[PDB]
């Protein structure tokens, strides 16, 4: 668990955009459930925006 | 003609305003749910009825606008094929898109599409199409129409086999 989810999510997004982390990884933050999910497994469908 | 399109747009705007007022009344728990039917189902039925009435009015306006010289109107009057719904969707309004006998459900978390915020019950976000095939459909309207078409195709594909088995 993490106490500052916003800062961690912002750092992860910045790293992914910069290219340090593979863009294919999917990071989702749900405030209602207060849950952070990271997915790196293959077979995941993604599109560019 | 221009006046007919203006009248259709005015009717659609009036229907949207009525739907918005009904939604606001429901939010303030000022709407009395129908006996037996739950509040959500009653609100959905009222919205669907209002949208259908608006679409029918737009279709009637388009039909009266069209003259006997019109080819589509002449063919419809001939009875060969077509109907009021066809003319209304081609010239006036496609209308509400129904899936499983109800509007487009929130496939995402309280969102029909990612382009709409959570808790968006406006007609445009609930499968309603306010643009006829002549003018075109927005991407959300196109996706809703595609969902309706897929539902219809699946229904036909299952019901043909069911009817064949019943006939056997």
């Amino acid at each position: 668990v993490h106490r500052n989810p916003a800062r961690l999510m912002e750092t992860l997004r910045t790293l992914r955009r910069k290219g340090d982390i593979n863009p294919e990884v999917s990071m989702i933050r749900d405030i209602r459930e207060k849950e952070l999910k990271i997915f790196t497994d293959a077979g995941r469908v993604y599109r560019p925006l | 003609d221009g006046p007919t399109m203006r009248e259709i747009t005015e009717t659609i705007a009036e229907a949207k305003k009525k739907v918005l007022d009904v939604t606001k009344e429901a939010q303030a728990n000022l709407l009395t749910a129908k006996h037996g039917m739950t509040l959500r189902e009653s609100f959905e039925d009222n919205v669907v009825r209002f949208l259908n009435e608006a679409r029918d009015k737009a279709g009637r306006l388009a039909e009266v606008n069209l003259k006997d010289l019109n080819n589509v109107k002449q063919m419809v009057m001939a009875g060969s094929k077509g109907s009021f719904i066809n003319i209304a969707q081609m010239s006036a309004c496609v209308g509400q898109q129904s899936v499983e006998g109800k509007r487009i459900a929130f496939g995402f978390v309280d969102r029909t599409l990612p382009h709409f915020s959570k808790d968006d019950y406006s007609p445009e976000s609930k499968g309603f199409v306010e643009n006829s095939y002549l003018r075109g459909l927005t991407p959300q309207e196109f996706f809703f129409h595609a969902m309706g078409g897929r539902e219809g195709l699946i229904d036909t594909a299952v019901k043909t086999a069911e009817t064949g088995y019943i006939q056997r």
């Binding site: 459930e33 | 939010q27 509040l39 959570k118």
Partner: protein, 118 residues
């Protein structure tokens, strides 16, 4: 309200003392006994008004997904707000909306007849 032993970290069963005519919470595992603060034993809440406003956090207003609104806040008169629906999902739940103000993080119901603190 349900509590524990506070010593062994275990649940407490209810029992009746007719000599003292009182409801006492005690666990058969140990000898610990306590007097119930309030006469609450069982509750089911077939229809519950709580749990509809859940998940609210300090940075709730910063979520792009939540739809904005320009309603004036009762206290700070801040137009900016984020509005959502009942968290609980049911076929009979009312469509009453809840508005949260970024400035003060105060949750208020959209209903005007009655004012709800949360």
């Amino acid at each position: 309200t349900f509590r524990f032993c506070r010593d062994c970290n275990n649940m407490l069963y209810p029992r009746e003392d007719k000599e003292n005519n009182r409801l006492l919470f005690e666990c058969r595992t140990c000898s610990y006994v306590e007097e119930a603060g309030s006469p609450l034993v069982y509750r089911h809440e077939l229809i519950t008004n709580i749990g509809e406003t859940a998940g609210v956090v300090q940075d709730i207003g910063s979520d792009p997904t939540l739809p904005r609104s320009d309603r004036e806040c009762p206290k700070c008169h801040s137009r900016e707000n984020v509005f959502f629906q009942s968290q609980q999902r049911r076929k009979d739940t009312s469509m009453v909306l809840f508005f949260v103000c970024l400035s003060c993080s105060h949750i208020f119901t959209s209903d005007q007849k009655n004012k709800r603190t949360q």
